[PDB]
Amino acid sequence: MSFFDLLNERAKRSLLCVGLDPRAKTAAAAVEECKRLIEQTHEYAAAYKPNAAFFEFFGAEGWAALSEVIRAVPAGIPVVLDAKRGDIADTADAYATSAFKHLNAHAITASPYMGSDSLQPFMRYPDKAVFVLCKTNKGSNDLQCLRVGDRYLYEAVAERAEGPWNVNGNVGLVVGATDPVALARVRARAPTLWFLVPGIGASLKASLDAGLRADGSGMLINVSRGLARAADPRAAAKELCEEINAIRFA
Amino acid sequence: MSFFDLLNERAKRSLLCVGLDPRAKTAAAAVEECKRLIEQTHEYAAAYKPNAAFFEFFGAEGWAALSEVIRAVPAGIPVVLDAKRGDIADTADAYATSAFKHLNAHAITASPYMGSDSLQPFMRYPDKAVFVLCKTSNKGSNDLQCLRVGDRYLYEAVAERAEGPWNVNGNVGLVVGATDPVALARVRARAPTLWFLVPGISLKASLDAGLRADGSGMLINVSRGLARAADPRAAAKELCEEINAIRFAA
Numbered sequence: 001m002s003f004f005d006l007l008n009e010r011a012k013r014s015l016l017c018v019g020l021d022p023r024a025k026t027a028a029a030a031v032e033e034c035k036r037l038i039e040q041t042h043e044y045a046a047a048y049k050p051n052a053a054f055f056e057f058f059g060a061e062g063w064a065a066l067s068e069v070i071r072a073v074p075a076g077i078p079v080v081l082d083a084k085r086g087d088i089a090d091t092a093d094a095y096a097t098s099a100f101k102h103l104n105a106h107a108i109t110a111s112p113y114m115g116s117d118s119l120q121p122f123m124r125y126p127d128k129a130v131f132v133l134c135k136t137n138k139g140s141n142d143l144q145c146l147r148v149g150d151r152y153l154y155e156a157v158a159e160r161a162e163g164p165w166n167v168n169g170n171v172g173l174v175v176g177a178t179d180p181v182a183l184a185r186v187r188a189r190a191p192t193l194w195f196l197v198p199g200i201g202a203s204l205k206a207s208l209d210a211g212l213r214a215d216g217s218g219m220l221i222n223v224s225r226g227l228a229r230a231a232d233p234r235a236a237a238k239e240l241c242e243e244i245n246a247i248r249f250a
Numbered sequence: 251m252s253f254f255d256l257l258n259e260r261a262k263r264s265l266l267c268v269g270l271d272p273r274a275k276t277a278a279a280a281v282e283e284c285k286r287l288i289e290q291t292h293e294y295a296a297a298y299k300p301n302a303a304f305f306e307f308f309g310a311e312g313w314a315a316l317s318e319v320i321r322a323v324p325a326g327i328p329v330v331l332d333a334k335r336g337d338i339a340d341t342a343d344a345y346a347t348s349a350f351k352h353l354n355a356h357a358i359t360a361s362p363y364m365g366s367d368s369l370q371p372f373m374r375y376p377d378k379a380v381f382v383l384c385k386t387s388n389k390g391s392n393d394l395q396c397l398r399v400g401d402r403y404l405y406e407a408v409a410e411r412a413e414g415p416w417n418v419n420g421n422v423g424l425v426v427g428a429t430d431p432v433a434l435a436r437v438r439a440r441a442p443t444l445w446f447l448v449p450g451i452s453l454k455a456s457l458d459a460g461l462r463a464d465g466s467g468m469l470i471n472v473s474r475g476l477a478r479a480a481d482p483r484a485a486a487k488e489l490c491e492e493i494n495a496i497r498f499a500a
Contacts, residue, residue, distance in 0.1 A: 053344035115390020139365020
């Protein structure tokens, strides 16, 4: 089962991605915190997204904690390591081996800035997925909205992803929820790719109308604070999952 | 004791940055390998650049190994953690705290793709430097970096931002490859004062294109050329002296 095999099975029930961004002060407490959130939300989760930086923060024990948390994700539910990596050759190979073999995540996020051969070391794993940063925060304007001919830079990234980068059919894009016009533009350039969509908790219907594919799928909607800090995380995930599906059905 | 205070002092003697990219198969062996290379090269090193991916590869033991290797670098020689990070908000804050406080590196490398607010969490440390990816030498450089924005390349637009709006704390540098001196000269034209971290040496042409008016502002990284030299001590001495001979020449 590839990442997308697992995701497409989950997508029959949910498009909700649950962020694992522990607020705990120690690695041990972080593990327990994440395990509890998994227990409460897995029935309504399409994926989990552990925060690579939050785990690195704990130092030595942080790695082990991340591995333990990934192990705690029920079989059948894919894990996207939000590590936003980008380098080349042996260095990129080492990041990919760490994420995919050592930590056993099913997917990673990656920067497009160094281009095709910076992305190849991740994308060469046919059973893993690579979500490439496309449209994201206020700094988006700096580079992403620069005009490269008759399109924005973020559109140029989209055209490569739904295009020559997708050798193993395992490329996705990171496309933010807070900009529905941009979301629609990316979907027009890349009509078949899965989007990882953060920032809903920073409009649900607008995002889905702009970003869903023709099949009513293809958006993985990430929520972190709205679930982790909820009075009832299970009920919050259930409600979000159902809200998304109601829109898909209509 | 800022990064640039340390670097300016070292630049009186050297512009050589020594990569720490261990080939060893265990964390413990990697530490010893790096310690040996530091011992052989420190008299001629302006900086050390540990490979964040290579240390992450060793998992739990990896972080501790990286911490130990950084601590092994003589007082007075700055450490650039080559991590190429880029994220937003609390996540970027976590990467910064990890690199600058927990690991006690003096500088980090970072992707520009998510723009100003993705870089601010690193740049807010006035005593730490942030080397932002600008122009890299790999084939993928064609994909984004060499796209045309108005009458210039994307990498020139990045250089302008870095020299201009981004450099509020005077701690921004750029990563600029040695393999194209024409591009290196374009970057120096857009960014007359910034330090460049220059991987992958074309030594004379690179220095002619990239040095500032003061004969400084380039940090020349060497990895394989030193670590795999029969005599790394003599290799570092020779490279340091060759760089300086070019700097001295009218």
